[PDB]
Amino acid sequence: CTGLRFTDDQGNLYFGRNLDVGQDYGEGVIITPRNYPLPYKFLDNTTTKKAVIGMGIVVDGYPSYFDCFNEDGLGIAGLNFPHFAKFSDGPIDGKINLASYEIMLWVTQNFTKVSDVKEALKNVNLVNEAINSSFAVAPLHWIISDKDEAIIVEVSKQYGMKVFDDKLGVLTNSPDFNWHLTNLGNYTGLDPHDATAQSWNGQKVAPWGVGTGSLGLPGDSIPADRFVKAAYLNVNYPTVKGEKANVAKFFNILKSVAMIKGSVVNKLGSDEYTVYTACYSAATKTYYCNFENDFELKTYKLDDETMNADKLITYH
Amino acid sequence: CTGLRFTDDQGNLYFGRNLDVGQDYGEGVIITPRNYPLPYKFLDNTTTKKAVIGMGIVVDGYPSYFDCFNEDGLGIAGLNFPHFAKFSDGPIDGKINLASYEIMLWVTQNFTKVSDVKEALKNVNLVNEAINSSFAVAPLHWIISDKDEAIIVEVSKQYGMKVFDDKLGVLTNSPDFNWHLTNLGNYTGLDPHDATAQSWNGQKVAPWGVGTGSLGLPGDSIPADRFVKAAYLNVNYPTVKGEKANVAKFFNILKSVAMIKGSVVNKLGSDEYTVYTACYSAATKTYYCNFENDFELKTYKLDDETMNADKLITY
Amino acid sequence: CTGLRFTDDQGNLYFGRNLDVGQDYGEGVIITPRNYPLPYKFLDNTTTKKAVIGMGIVVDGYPSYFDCFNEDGLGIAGLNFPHFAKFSDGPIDGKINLASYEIMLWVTQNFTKVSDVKEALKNVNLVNEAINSSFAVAPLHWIISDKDEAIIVEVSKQYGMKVFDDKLGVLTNSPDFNWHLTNLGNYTGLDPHDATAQSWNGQKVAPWGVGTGSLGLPGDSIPADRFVKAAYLNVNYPTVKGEKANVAKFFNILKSVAMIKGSVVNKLGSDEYTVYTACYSAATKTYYCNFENDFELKTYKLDDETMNADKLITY
Amino acid sequence: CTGLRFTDDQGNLYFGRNLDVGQDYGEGVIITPRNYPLPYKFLDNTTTKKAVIGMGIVVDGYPSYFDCFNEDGLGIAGLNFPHFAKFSDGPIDGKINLASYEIMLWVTQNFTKVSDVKEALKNVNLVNEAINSSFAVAPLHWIISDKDEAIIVEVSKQYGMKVFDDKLGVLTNSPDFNWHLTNLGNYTGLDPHDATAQSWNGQKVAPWGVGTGSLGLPGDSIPADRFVKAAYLNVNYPTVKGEKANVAKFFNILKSVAMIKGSVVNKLGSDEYTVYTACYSAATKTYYCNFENDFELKTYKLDDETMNADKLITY
Ligand SMILES: C[C@H](CCC(=O)O)[C@H]1CC[C@H]2[C@@H]3[C@H](O)C[C@@H]4C[C@H](O)CC[C@]4(C)[C@H]3CC[C@]12C
Ligand SMILES: C[C@H](CCC(=O)O)[C@H]1CC[C@H]2[C@@H]3[C@H](O)C[C@@H]4C[C@H](O)CC[C@]4(C)[C@H]3CC[C@]12C
Ligand SMILES: C[C@H](CCC(=O)O)[C@H]1CC[C@H]2[C@@H]3[C@H](O)C[C@@H]4C[C@H](O)CC[C@]4(C)[C@H]3CC[C@]12C
Structure with a gap:
C-alpha cells in the first residue's frame, strides 16, 4: 500500500491511497450519512455527526473503512503494518479505548483538524479486538x-x-x-x-x-x-x-x-498488486477511484442528497 | 517515451505509448479517413487506402503522427532516438525513398501484417528531410x-x-x-x-x-x-x-x-515528463488516452462515420 | 570504517577493521606490555593486567587506541558514529564512569570473555571527556x-x-x-x-x-x-x-x-578513504596491517619479549 | 576477471589483473628467458627475443600465459569473453595466423609499442585451435x-x-x-x-x-x-x-x-572467485601477486639472472 497527500496553491487537499493486496476482498465505495448509528465497544454508542466517504466493507450495518474522508476535509487511511502492529489485550482504565477498527470513524466523526487529533491521541488506547469474534484483527498503521x-x-x-x-x-x-x-x-x-x-x-x-x-x-x-x-x-x-x-x-x-x-508473487503463490487507487478531493467532496481491471476514473460525491440519506449508500 | 504492445487470450492487440517530452507540441487526436489525399516527397502522390487514428499535428492538411494505427489492426509509434538516428542526405536511386516523417502513413496505409512490412522495408531508404523548411527532422526510431x-x-x-x-x-x-x-x-x-x-x-x-x-x-x-x-x-x-x-x-x-x-529536469532547465499515455485497441478500433493534467480516459473511434469522412477529424 | 570478525573451524578468531578517514592522525602500531601504568579519569589509577596490541597514538605515555586486542583473545574497535554518539555530561554517581576513550583499555585490560564484558557494561557510564584539552571527543561506537x-x-x-x-x-x-x-x-x-x-x-x-x-x-x-x-x-x-x-x-x-x-570527497573537500586495514589473529597473537600507500602486509606480535617490556613499544 | 592499467607522474606503467575462476588451473609465475624455444602452429618456429614474466601453466615446455609482460614494458592479459569469443576454423591465406593461445607470446616477443601492435593486428587472424587436443580453446579477449x-x-x-x-x-x-x-x-x-x-x-x-x-x-x-x-x-x-x-x-x-x-556460485555449483591479483611494474620489471588463500605480496623479477637463464623459471 501507498498513502499520498498534497495540496494545491489554494489549500485544497488531495489525499488517498493504493490498496496493494493478494486478492480482492469485495470492497466498494460506502457513503455513511449524517446521523447514522455508530456503536462503540468501549465508548458510549452514538450517531455519526459528519458524512464520510471511502472504500470498505459493511459488516452487520457497520461501515468498516479501508480509508475514510469526512465532509470537513479530514481523512484517514489504514495501511498494512505487518511484523510490527500490536494492540492492547484489553481496555485500559482512564484511556479513550478503541478497538483498532474503530479508529476510522472515531477520527472522522470527532475532528476537523489534525492538530486536534494529535492532542486527543495522547489519551487513546487501541485494543486488539475485531468487530466480532469471527474476524481477524488487521495489523494496520494509519496516515x-x-x-x-x-x-x-x-x-x-x-x-x-x-x-x-x-x-x-x-x-x-x-x-x-x-x-x-x-x-x-x-x-x-x-x-x-x-x-x-x-x-x-x-x-x-x-x-x-x-x-x-x-x-x-x-x-x-x-x-x-x-x-x-x-x-x-x-x-x-x-x-x-x-x-x-x-x-x-x-x-x-x-x-x-x-x-x-x-x-510480485508472495510466498503463498498469489500475485500481489494494486487492486485500486483512490483520491479524495476535499474541495469537491469527491472520491475518485479506479481498479486494476477497469481504468476508468469513477466518481462518488458527498452532496446534499448523499450526506442526508437515512441508510448507508454502497456502490459496487 | 515508452512503447508497449501485448495481446489478450484471443489475439486482440493493445498497443500504444507514453509521450515523454520537455516542451509543448500542440498535439491532438487525428482521424485520417479513407480516400484522403496523401502526398509523398519522393513517391507518387495518392489517396489513403484505409482509415487511421492516432496523436499528431496537422501541417497544411497533412496529418503528421507521433503514433498511428490503422483500421486493420497495424500500428506504428515514433520515439526519440537521440545521438543515434541519422537519415540519408537525399533520396537514393532504386530505393523506396521516404522522408523520415512519412514512415508513419507509409506503414499504416500500405500493410496489415508486420511480416509484409518487414519484407518491404528491405528496399526502403529514410531521408533527412522535414515536412517543410520550418520544421527540423526528428531523430526518431519506431516500433x-x-x-x-x-x-x-x-x-x-x-x-x-x-x-x-x-x-x-x-x-x-x-x-x-x-x-x-x-x-x-x-x-x-x-x-x-x-x-x-x-x-x-x-x-x-x-x-x-x-x-x-x-x-x-x-x-x-x-x-x-x-x-x-x-x-x-x-x-x-x-x-x-x-x-x-x-x-x-x-x-x-x-x-x-x-x-x-x-x-526530471533537462540540461536546459525544463521538466521532462509523460504528457500523455495512449492505447489503441484493435478489437474496438478505439484510441484511449489521458494526459498529465487530466486523468480521465478519453476515447476516440474509427467507425462507419469517422472512417468515411471527407476531411481530417481533429480533437 | 568497517569492523569484521569470524572464526575458523577450530575457534581461532580473526578480528579487525578498516580505518576510513579524511585526514591522517599519525597513528601506528603500539604494544602495551603487562604492568604498565594505566591512569583513569574517574576510577583509581592502576597498572595493566594484560598485554595489548593495536593501532593508535601515544599521548603523554598513554596509548590511545583506535582498535585494541589483548593477549587473551578479546578485542575492541572504535568506529565513527556521527549524528548519534552522545556521552554523558560528566560522571554519574553509582556507575563505573569512563571517559569514552578509556573504553578501549577498560575492556581489554579487565576481561577475557564478551559474556563478562556484557554483564559489566550494565553498570558503565561513558562520559563526554577527552584525554586532555588538546583533543576533541570522538563520536564513536564500538564492536x-x-x-x-x-x-x-x-x-x-x-x-x-x-x-x-x-x-x-x-x-x-x-x-x-x-x-x-x-x-x-x-x-x-x-x-x-x-x-x-x-x-x-x-x-x-x-x-x-x-x-x-x-x-x-x-x-x-x-x-x-x-x-x-x-x-x-x-x-x-x-x-x-x-x-x-x-x-x-x-x-x-x-x-x-x-x-x-x-x-569519496566529503563536504569539506577532502578525500575520504581506507587509510589502513588491520587483522588480529588471536591464535598467533599477531596484528597484521597494510596501508593505502603501502600494500605489504606488516606483522607485529605479542610474545615473551614484547608482553614483558618496561615501556610502550611503538612501530 | 578484471584488467587494470595506469601510470604514475613519470610514465611508469602499473598493469595487471584479477583472475576470477571456478576451478583450479594449476597456475604459477613463469619467467621465460631470452632465446627460449618458441614454436608456432602456423608460423615458422623461432626463439624468444625478449624476456617475459607472468602467470600461466607450462605445457610440454611451452609457457602458456594468462597474463604476460615483456622486459620492454609492454604486456597483455587474456580475460574470459564467453558467449562472444569466436576464432576462425582454420588458418586464412595471406594473414598472420595465430592459434588464439599464441597471441600472448606473439605480442610480447615482437613489439614494444601498442601503436605498432595495433598496426600489425590489421593482418592477424586468430584460429580456433588449442595447444593440443587435451585442451579446449579458451573463449578470451585481451587487454x-x-x-x-x-x-x-x-x-x-x-x-x-x-x-x-x-x-x-x-x-x-x-x-x-x-x-x-x-x-x-x-x-x-x-x-x-x-x-x-x-x-x-x-x-x-x-x-x-x-x-x-x-x-x-x-x-x-x-x-x-x-x-x-x-x-x-x-x-x-x-x-x-x-x-x-x-x-x-x-x-x-x-x-x-x-x-x-x-x-558467487555458478550453475555447476562451484564457487567463482578472485584466485589471484597481480601487478606488473614496468619501472622495476617486477611482478607482484597475492592469492585468495595467502595475502602476502610476493615479488618476482626480470633481472640479469632470470632474463638470461637457460630454462623456464617457475614458481
Ligand atoms: C487478516 C490478516 C491478518 C493476518 C496477521 O495478523 O498476520 C490481514 C493481513 C493483511 C490485511 C489487509 C491489508 O492490511 C490491506 C487492507 C487494509 C485495510 O485498512 C483493512 C483491510 C485490508 C484488506 C487488510 C485486512 C486484514 C488482512 C488481510
Ligand atoms: C471480506 C473479506 C474476506 C473475503 C473472502 O471471502 O475471501 C474479509 C477478510 C479480512 C476482513 C477484514 C479484517 O478482518 C479486518 C477488519 C476487521 C473488522 O472487525 C471488520 C472490518 C475488517 C476490515 C474486515 C472486513 C472483511 C475482510 C476484508
Ligand atoms: C576514524 C574515526 C573518525 C574519523 C572519521 O571516520 O572521519 C575515529 C576512530 C578512532 C578515533 C581516534 C581515537 O578515538 C583516539 C583519539 C581520541 C581523541 O579523543 C580524538 C583523536 C583520536 C586520535 C580519535 C580520532 C578519530 C578516530 C581516528
Whole structure:
C-alpha cells in the first residue's frame, strides 16, 4: 500500500491511497450519512455527526473503512503494518479505548483538524479486538491528514504508540515510520537535474537520454523502496492548479509506485498488486477511484442528497 | 517515451505509448479517413487506402503522427532516438525513398501484417528531410506491431538501417535496440517470487513486506532503466480477458514507467515528463488516452462515420 | 570504517577493521606490555593486567587506541558514529564512569570473555571527556569480540546506551545498529547462486557472466550499503583452514568494502578513504596491517619479549 | 576477471589483473628467458627475443600465459569473453595466423609499442585451435598496454575482429567492449562529491555518512557492474608517486572489485572467485601477486639472472 497527500496553491487537499493486496476482498465505495448509528465497544454508542466517504466493507450495518474522508476535509487511511502492529489485550482504565477498527470513524466523526487529533491521541488506547469474534484483527498503521498537515499513527510491539508528523505526505508498509525517515538520508544523492557529458580520462561519457540524476532510485515494490520513490516524487512534483490537474497529479504519482500484477508473487503463490487507487478531493467532496481491471476514473460525491440519506449508500 | 504492445487470450492487440517530452507540441487526436489525399516527397502522390487514428499535428492538411494505427489492426509509434538516428542526405536511386516523417502513413496505409512490412522495408531508404523548411527532422526510431509480432526500425550513423524482432513488446529511447536486448541479461537475477526468511549466521533476516525478489529493478527514467522495467512488467503481466481489463492492464504498465513531472529536469532547465499515455485497441478500433493534467480516459473511434469522412477529424 | 570478525573451524578468531578517514592522525602500531601504568579519569589509577596490541597514538605515555586486542583473545574497535554518539555530561554517581576513550583499555585490560564484558557494561557510564584539552571527543561506537561472540556498544542521544549481539560479525557507521539489522530484510533477494537462461515471451535472456544472483548489492561507500555488503560477504564466505588462509579471507572481505581514494570527497573537500586495514589473529597473537600507500602486509606480535617490556613499544 | 592499467607522474606503467575462476588451473609465475624455444602452429618456429614474466601453466615446455609482460614494458592479459569469443576454423591465406593461445607470446616477443601492435593486428587472424587436443580453446579477449596507451582486442561471432582504444584502463568480461563503453553513459549521475542536507518539503533529509554521491554504484560481480565500478575507480583515483604507492593503489582498486569467495556460485555449483591479483611494474620489471588463500605480496623479477637463464623459471 501507498498513502499520498498534497495540496494545491489554494489549500485544497488531495489525499488517498493504493490498496496493494493478494486478492480482492469485495470492497466498494460506502457513503455513511449524517446521523447514522455508530456503536462503540468501549465508548458510549452514538450517531455519526459528519458524512464520510471511502472504500470498505459493511459488516452487520457497520461501515468498516479501508480509508475514510469526512465532509470537513479530514481523512484517514489504514495501511498494512505487518511484523510490527500490536494492540492492547484489553481496555485500559482512564484511556479513550478503541478497538483498532474503530479508529476510522472515531477520527472522522470527532475532528476537523489534525492538530486536534494529535492532542486527543495522547489519551487513546487501541485494543486488539475485531468487530466480532469471527474476524481477524488487521495489523494496520494509519496516515491522517487535513489541508495543513499529516500524521502517522503506529502502535507496535517494538515501540508502543507513536505519532509522527509526516511532511513528506506519504506512507507505505513496514518497518516503522522513523526507520523510513532515517532511510531517506541514504538517498540524498538523488537529483532531478540531469547529469551532463563527462570526460573519464579522456573517454567521452555522456547521457543517452534524460533522467540520469536519479540513478539509484529503486523501482521494485519492497515497502522501503516505494517509500523512497513516493516521497521523492511527492516533494519534487510542482504545485498544480485546478481540480482536474491535481487529481491527475495524484494518480500520476500513485500509479508510478503501484504494485504491478505479475511482478510480485508472495510466498503463498498469489500475485500481489494494486487492486485500486483512490483520491479524495476535499474541495469537491469527491472520491475518485479506479481498479486494476477497469481504468476508468469513477466518481462518488458527498452532496446534499448523499450526506442526508437515512441508510448507508454502497456502490459496487 | 515508452512503447508497449501485448495481446489478450484471443489475439486482440493493445498497443500504444507514453509521450515523454520537455516542451509543448500542440498535439491532438487525428482521424485520417479513407480516400484522403496523401502526398509523398519522393513517391507518387495518392489517396489513403484505409482509415487511421492516432496523436499528431496537422501541417497544411497533412496529418503528421507521433503514433498511428490503422483500421486493420497495424500500428506504428515514433520515439526519440537521440545521438543515434541519422537519415540519408537525399533520396537514393532504386530505393523506396521516404522522408523520415512519412514512415508513419507509409506503414499504416500500405500493410496489415508486420511480416509484409518487414519484407518491404528491405528496399526502403529514410531521408533527412522535414515536412517543410520550418520544421527540423526528428531523430526518431519506431516500433511497429500487429497482433502477431512487433518490429523495431532503427536507422543510425552507427549501424545503418536495422530491423529487429521485438518479442518483449517494448521500446524506449537510446541507445540502440540490440544494446538494450543485451542489457537484459544483466537483470536475470530479477524474480517476481518473494524471498523468504533467512539465517545470516544465526541472525534471522526476513522480508518486511512483499516485493523482495525484484531487488535491483531500477525506478528512474534513464531510457535503459525504463526499458528493463517495462520489459519485465510486460512479460510477467498475466494475460487478461476483455476490453476493459486489457486497457487497464495497458495503462497500469505504462503509468508505472511514466516520467513523473518534477523528477526530471533537462540540461536546459525544463521538466521532462509523460504528457500523455495512449492505447489503441484493435478489437474496438478505439484510441484511449489521458494526459498529465487530466486523468480521465478519453476515447476516440474509427467507425462507419469517422472512417468515411471527407476531411481530417481533429480533437 | 568497517569492523569484521569470524572464526575458523577450530575457534581461532580473526578480528579487525578498516580505518576510513579524511585526514591522517599519525597513528601506528603500539604494544602495551603487562604492568604498565594505566591512569583513569574517574576510577583509581592502576597498572595493566594484560598485554595489548593495536593501532593508535601515544599521548603523554598513554596509548590511545583506535582498535585494541589483548593477549587473551578479546578485542575492541572504535568506529565513527556521527549524528548519534552522545556521552554523558560528566560522571554519574553509582556507575563505573569512563571517559569514552578509556573504553578501549577498560575492556581489554579487565576481561577475557564478551559474556563478562556484557554483564559489566550494565553498570558503565561513558562520559563526554577527552584525554586532555588538546583533543576533541570522538563520536564513536564500538564492536567487541572474542572467539564465541561479538557485541556492539552504542550510546546515543536517540536511544541511550544499547548493547547488541552481532551474529553478522560486522559494523560500519551511522545510523544505529538496529536500523542496519532491520535494513538487511530489504536485501533478502540477494542470492549467491547465479541466475540461468530465461524466456521473456520467447526472447532468450541469459546471463553474460557469473554474479547475476547478487543483483542490487550496493557498491558505494554509504555506511548502510557497506554494512549490507560486509554482512553478506562475511556470512557467505566459507570457513577456511589455517593462519594464512584466514588472514587472507579477512583482507579479501575488508578490501572488497574499502573506501577507495578519489571515489569519496566529503563536504569539506577532502578525500575520504581506507587509510589502513588491520587483522588480529588471536591464535598467533599477531596484528597484521597494510596501508593505502603501502600494500605489504606488516606483522607485529605479542610474545615473551614484547608482553614483558618496561615501556610502550611503538612501530 | 578484471584488467587494470595506469601510470604514475613519470610514465611508469602499473598493469595487471584479477583472475576470477571456478576451478583450479594449476597456475604459477613463469619467467621465460631470452632465446627460449618458441614454436608456432602456423608460423615458422623461432626463439624468444625478449624476456617475459607472468602467470600461466607450462605445457610440454611451452609457457602458456594468462597474463604476460615483456622486459620492454609492454604486456597483455587474456580475460574470459564467453558467449562472444569466436576464432576462425582454420588458418586464412595471406594473414598472420595465430592459434588464439599464441597471441600472448606473439605480442610480447615482437613489439614494444601498442601503436605498432595495433598496426600489425590489421593482418592477424586468430584460429580456433588449442595447444593440443587435451585442451579446449579458451573463449578470451585481451587487454594490451604500454606506458602510453591500452587497446582491447576482441574477435566475436557478432562483430569479427575489433581493436579498441581503452582510455579507461580497465576490462572485464562479456559483453563486448563497445557495449560497456556505451553503458557508462547510464552512470553519469555518479559523483565522488558527497551530497549535503536537503529539505524535502521541510523534512530535514541529510546524509548519515560519507559516500552519498555514488548512489547507484553496483557492488555485485556481474561483468557489466565490475566494469562500471573499476572504470569509475580508476579514473577518479589520484596519480600517486613512487613504486610502493602505485603498487598499493593498483591492489586497492583490484581488491575493491574482486569476486569474493562464497558470494558467487555458478550453475555447476562451484564457487567463482578472485584466485589471484597481480601487478606488473614496468619501472622495476617486477611482478607482484597475492592469492585468495595467502595475502602476502610476493615479488618476482626480470633481472640479469632470470632474463638470461637457460630454462623456464617457475614458481
Ligand atoms: C487478516 C490478516 C491478518 C493476518 C496477521 O495478523 O498476520 C490481514 C493481513 C493483511 C490485511 C489487509 C491489508 O492490511 C490491506 C487492507 C487494509 C485495510 O485498512 C483493512 C483491510 C485490508 C484488506 C487488510 C485486512 C486484514 C488482512 C488481510
Ligand atoms: C471480506 C473479506 C474476506 C473475503 C473472502 O471471502 O475471501 C474479509 C477478510 C479480512 C476482513 C477484514 C479484517 O478482518 C479486518 C477488519 C476487521 C473488522 O472487525 C471488520 C472490518 C475488517 C476490515 C474486515 C472486513 C472483511 C475482510 C476484508
Ligand atoms: C576514524 C574515526 C573518525 C574519523 C572519521 O571516520 O572521519 C575515529 C576512530 C578512532 C578515533 C581516534 C581515537 O578515538 C583516539 C583519539 C581520541 C581523541 O579523543 C580524538 C583523536 C583520536 C586520535 C580519535 C580520532 C578519530 C578516530 C581516528
